[PDB]
């Protein structure tokens, strides 16, 4: 059967965004270490976590995230996304609103490492994607 869990994407949710910031998890997770998402310095924004639960109940599902600066982690989050059972409709979590760095020397390349896990520390999905900040959405 396929898996209990089946995380299906990602979205960077930002208001001010000229384009959809979203990574289908569904597929080759490869591309995306060689792609980047534009975010405009010390804009707003949260993110979205789309996944479903086809049998069993889960509990203690968390969204970890550990980002990354010229190959150091500056920075590691834990969501707690919550226990839920299985449901035909799509699951959406939202990360609390978080504010992008500013100024020169927060600009630049952010690499990071996302997983999606449990209690039982399930590895349901882990994929590793990339951001840009700039002085605007140049």
């Not at 597929?27 to 949260?46: A, M, N, P």
């Not at 699951?91 to 997983?115: D, H, N």
Request: net charge negative.
């Amino acid at each position: 059967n396929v898996p209990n869990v089946v995380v299906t994407g990602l979205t960077l949710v930002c208001s001010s965004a000229p384009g959809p910031l979203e990574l289908d998890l569904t597929g080759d997770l490869e591309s995306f270490k060689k792609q980047s998402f534009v975010l405009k310095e010390g804009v707003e924004y949260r993110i979205k976590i789309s996944f479903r639960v086809n049998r069993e109940i889960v509990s203690g599902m968390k969204y970890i995230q550990h980002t990354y600066r010229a190959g150091v982690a500056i920075d590691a989050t834990d969501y707690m996304v919550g226990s839920y059972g299985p449901r035909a409709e799509e699951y959406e979590f939202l990360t609390p609103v978080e504010e992008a760095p500013k100024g020169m020397l927060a600009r630049g390349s952010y690499s990071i490492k996302s997983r999606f896990t449990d209690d039982d520390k399930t590895d349901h999905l882990s994929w590793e994607w990339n951001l840009t900040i700039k002085k605007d959405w140049k």
